[PDB]
Design a protein around this nucleic acid. Structure first.
Ligand SMILES: C[S@@+](CC[C@H](N)C(=O)[O-])C[C@H]1O[C@@H](n2cnc3c(N)ncnc32)[C@H](O)[C@@H]1O
Ligand SMILES: [Zn+2]
Ligand SMILES: [Zn+2]
Ligand SMILES: [Zn+2]
Lengths: 86, 109, 98, 219, 95, 103, 82, 110, 97
DNA sequence: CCGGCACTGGAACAGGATGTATATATCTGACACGTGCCTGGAGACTAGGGAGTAATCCCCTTGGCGGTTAAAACGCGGGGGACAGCGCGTACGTGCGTTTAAGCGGTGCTAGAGCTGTCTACGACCAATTGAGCGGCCTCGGCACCGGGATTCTCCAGGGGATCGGGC
DNA sequence: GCCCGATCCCCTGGAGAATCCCGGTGCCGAGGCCGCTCAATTGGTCGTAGACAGCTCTAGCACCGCTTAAACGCACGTACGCGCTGTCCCCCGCGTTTTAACCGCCAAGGGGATTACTCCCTAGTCTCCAGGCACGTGTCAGATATATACATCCTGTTCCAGTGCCGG
């Protein structure tokens, strides 16, 4: 049960990392309070998908989240993802 | 058997497996009794729809002066056609990047 | 005087280099440390396959990269060039996600 | 010496004319609450004070608290009859009213447009010089002849301290002169007005202001 | 041991060589065209289903697989694919 | 000679705040039924000629077209306010539809 | 009988009323030529599918379930007609 | 048969047809074999989600001094609970009208 | 009149579940059809979702366990926590008697 | 009273210093075949019911006409909200030096997913008997609307008393 | 000095006025009550789909060391928010007059639902045999790493463009 408790790993999505995703989208100049709402937008997308992946796993009586449960959970919300089999 | 097997996908002049599309319709619980002109009709459409998304990816590969088709060519071939961009509206393709575009108001005065 | 490129051109000189690559733009270990911590509330002592972590990074990045292109139209509507945090909310609200 | 004029509290039809009431099924509801010093008051916002609706004593959620019940509670000053010069008995107040205060409501006799033409062409030509006509709507004309109030008892000007507004209550229109400023006692009470004669002018505008030259017919 | 895993690879590769003789195609792209076909298939079947069930029948036929195309494919694909299919269905029987 | 007086008019912006509070409370229909019923028959002569309708079918489209337009005129307003304005110009509908996904 | 011009049946106050139910206070002078262009294509993407469903069953009359199905295809569900 | 017929809906204590749900599951082409405790789990859910709407329709109908439900009360009942509103997002109810709201900057200022 | 064919609906169960919550109110002919479509629309979601859970795992039976997951996927936060109890109780009440 | 010794703002363009393609080598790991063999497609016949098909009844979609009044079209005013310009300073971009985790080779260990055989409990199938459920028929019968006589409140009323200009 | 014939503040018979409320009339819309028929219940046989106690072996988690790209601050100066004022024309509120939606009728027939009968297109069982899936080996298309060869951006030094404002 090596479950060494964790704390505040959201601050790993650093500043230049977010700036790169920004630049790819086509923005020329960025404010200074976006780096505190992008995290709050990401940490809500991830839950609606991970909860469904874990539910799809439990029903099959397994213990390893595979790479098809994520594809199913994503196809569930109209966000189909080609590439990883299915 | 008396004669020799003359496979069904060669009577019609197709490439996709009629012997397989039929069984797939049957053992998938879409209806009770499956007709006999259904698989022939469906395999032909499946053949036509894939005989075009390659005909554009090939033409897009010859502009990088390469020979092998990779994911990026498929995205650049799809986001530039007004009908495939409407049929594949909500679909994401891995390893595909974005389509090169930049605004008009941001360029330097 | 180290030749001092005039402010506002280095950005326009990489907007057009990040639109031709195909790599992913977040660090792999700091991403895989976040997933294993969000999913600790729902079920206990899980184990993730190695090809189901690389399957979430693409969804997340393709979501953010397509949200910023819709943020960058409000800031132009209001006669600005710098996006602010009172814009993201308008795009989400109009989409229908909150 | 005031001439004989009949008194009456509220309006009245004068023949074919008829007023229309309103039930409690579509009367516009307020949104305030019986919370503080001014429940549906003047300062504290009220979606009926703003849009020129006078609340009903029952539809209000507060109930017996909405101060916006005026054209019924009949809140006035006394303002004993004063005498002016050149006009008649122009009147002076005897309070220290603030701004946004109510003054007497113009109530008289309601007559059809076609009917009005007859009732003025009967008397006007016989040298009576009737000058009390004020239109509210097509087929509505409030006349200050047979009956009236302290409302007929007003005086035109060009630089007044009060004006003529137009509210609607219980589905029907109203007319109430208001206080535009905080005017104390010892001051003349008058309101300017616009008109449109059918004949001709008979007197240059004469008020006592600086730019009150005007006429009777011009703005 | 490693029972099997069917796919459409050996058929996509046969189709490619009729429109581009000297051209190859890598694994990451084969594994995308596979899912593309395996996705369009179920959208086209899963509505002939509901048509047959609305009109109170029990058989899927070509009269269903046509009406299931004019509703899915938009524009000019719906005018070319329909012309395509009714060639194979005609030629097949006459043999 | 014998004239008539006239009270004030409403300051611009009150007969437009009454109509809102009046219309957001009733449930009737807001387009003329015969003019709408002729447009439906004029459009549908391009797909198949000489087809008839059902009295309860021609009234099934009107309960959706309007619930569409009313929901669009609610997202135009948020943009028109975003630009620090009160009026709604044509260059807002296009932004709304563009972000939403139609064009 | 042939027809034409009938898009001019969505009059000006008929758009002003739908606006007021939306919640807009002032209205420019060119919305009245932009809304009749937004309304004329939402109707085709529905009448085409209604006509298709009817054409399939060999009828000659657009019944009141074809419209419900055509609107259900595009995520615009309708409650209260069937 | 021989003895008295006790309807399959009565044993569990429901009010919805556990006899009829089973036939619809069997003739809809959803599978090849249907279990035995499927309709009993499926009807006890279609009952709760109708109680949950008629309750609020009544609670928002008595607030107008009426004793009869009309389509307007249904929408007023559903557009105010943030879970029924999420389960019923893209749905249009006929003869329903809109909710009352005006923005905060269009109110005339002093 | 040829004694026209019959038509089935939920109109005498919707009306029963009303009197156990409000023993005084009535319902209108035009606000009945809405609840009718409501039930005939929430039935398909919960059936079809289990019809694919039972296929991803190579089975051919719709047990009383697929319906306990289709609910956990379809319904929101606090709604999907009472329906589960309703179901798991009205089956224990049936398996004994 | 505008122009002339020197005088002050806009314009032009090479010239530097940096970043972005060219062509050569070079080399490696994945693409494209060949090979065996096991499933799964194919070829013929037999037996049961779903759909093509002809004839019938009658519901309900068009077509036309007349009167009413609620709504649409047009022109006058006249005040308020959109667009342009200016000025002040706060905040994000650019480059350079310094501190810290991502990343690439391994190596060890075992936890859990995939297979194989036995075998019992469970849902499809079928025949028989009877009670729930839809269609139609009446009744009531709580809800809108007027007579309608009279019931707290309010006048019009001509007259009952308080009052005076001289009267005697 | 003491007193009279009308004349202004009060007073209640006629009336009068709407108008809470007791009490007639008429509803179209739901609410309870009988024939009628067919889907749901019960009682039995059967042949599989699925639970389960072993059993092999792949791969997801943990440790360690090491060389180097990427994150981290820090100072400056500039290009962009933001707030304010003045001109103005465009969208709103009214009065008249014109028009064609609406309700309510009569009249003729296209085509939508049913129903009884006969054929022919699929589900289904055996044998029979070849297209396709995993394995194992060979070699070439494309990713580095240098070395030029430019093409893009930024700025100081003359030249027009009229000249500062003094004057006799
Ligand atoms: C309604 S009467 C009021 C009479 C008197 N003031 C009173 O209180 O009884 C107003 C009179 O003032 C006159 N008047 C109005 N405006 C006037 C003016 N500007 N110059 C002279 N007389 C005017 C009118 O002719 C009218 O006869
Ligand atoms: Zn109030
Ligand atoms: Zn009030
Ligand atoms: Zn004057």
């Amino acid at each position: 049960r090596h479950r060494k408790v964790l704390r505040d790993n959201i601050q790993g999505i650093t500043k230049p990392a977010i700036r790169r995703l920004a630049r790819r989208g086509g923005v020329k100049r960025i404010s200074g309070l976006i780096y505190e709402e992008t995290r709050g937008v990401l940490k809500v997308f991830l839950e609606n998908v991970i909860r469904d992946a874990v539910t799809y796993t439990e029903h099959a009586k397994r213990k390893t989240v595979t790479a098809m449960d994520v594809v199913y959970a994503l196809k569930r919300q109209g966000r189909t993802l080609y590439g990883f089999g299915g | 058997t008396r004669a020799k097997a003359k496979t069904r996908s060669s009577r019609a002049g197709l490439q996709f497996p009629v012997g397989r599309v039929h069984r797939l319709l049957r053992k998938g619980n879409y209806a009770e009794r499956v007709g006999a002109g259904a698989p022939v009709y469906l395999a032909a459409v499946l053949e036509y729809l894939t005989a075009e998304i390659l005909e554009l990816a090939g033409n897009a590969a010859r502009d990088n002066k390469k020979t092998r088709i990779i994911p990026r060519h498929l995205q650049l071939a799809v986001r530039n056609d007004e009908e495939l961009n409407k049929l594949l509206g909500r679909v994401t393709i891995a390893q595909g990047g974005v389509l090169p575009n930049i605004q008009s108001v941001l360029l330097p005065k | 005087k180290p030749h001092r490129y005039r402010p506002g051109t280095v950005a326009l000189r990489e907007i057009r280099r990040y639109q031709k690559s195909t790599e992913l733009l977040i660090r792999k270990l700091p991403f895989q440390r976040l997933v294993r911590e969000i999913a600790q509330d729902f079920k206990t002592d899980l184990r993730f396959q190695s090809s189901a972590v690389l399957a979430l990074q693409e969804a997340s990045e393709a979501y953010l990269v397509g949200l910023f292109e819709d943020t960058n139209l409000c800031g132009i509507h209001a006669k600005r060039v710098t996006i602010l945090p009172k814009d993201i909310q308008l795009a989400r609200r109009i989409r229908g996600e909150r | 010496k005031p001439p004989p004029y009949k008194h009456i509290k509220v309006n009245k039809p004068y023949g074919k004319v008829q007023i229309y009431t309103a039930d409690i099924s579509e009367i516009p509801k307020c949104n305030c609450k019986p919370t503080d010093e001014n429940p549906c008051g003047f300062d504290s916002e009220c979606l009926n004070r703003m849009l020129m609706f006078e609340c009903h004593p029952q539809v209000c959620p507060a109930g017996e608290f909405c101060q916006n019940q005026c054209f019924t509670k009949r809140q006035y000053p006394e303002t004993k009859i004063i005498k002016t010069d050149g006009k008649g008995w122009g009147l002076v107040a005897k309070r220290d009213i603030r701004k946004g205060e109510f003054v007497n409501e113009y109530v008289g006799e309601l007559i059809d447009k076609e009917e009005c033409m007859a009732r003025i062409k009967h008397a006007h030509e016989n040298d009576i010089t009737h000058f009390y006509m004020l239109t509210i709507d097509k087929d509505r004309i409030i006349d200050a002849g047979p009956k009236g109030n302290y409302s007929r008892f007003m005086n035109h000007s060009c630089q007044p301290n009060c004006e003529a507004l137009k509210w609607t209550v219980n589905g029907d229109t109203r007319v109430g002169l208001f206080a535009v400023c905080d005017i104390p006692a010892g001051t003349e009470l008058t309101f300017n007005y616009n008109l449109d004669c059918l004949g001709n002018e008979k007197t240059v505008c004469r008020c006592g202001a600086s730019n009150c030259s005007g006429f009777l017919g011009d703005r | 041991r490693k029972t099997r895993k069917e796919s459409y690879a050996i058929y996509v590769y046969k189709v490619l060589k009729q429109v581009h003789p000297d051209t190859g195609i890598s694994s990451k792209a084969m594994s995308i065209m596979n899912s593309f076909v395996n996705d369009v298939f179920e959208r086209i079947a899963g509505e002939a289903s509901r048509l047959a069930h609305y009109n109170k029948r029990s058989t899927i036929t070509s009269r269903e697989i046509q009406t299931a195309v004019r509703l899915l494919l938009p524009g000019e694909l719906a005018k070319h694919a329909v012309s395509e299919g009714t060639k194979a269905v005609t030629k097949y029987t006459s043999a």
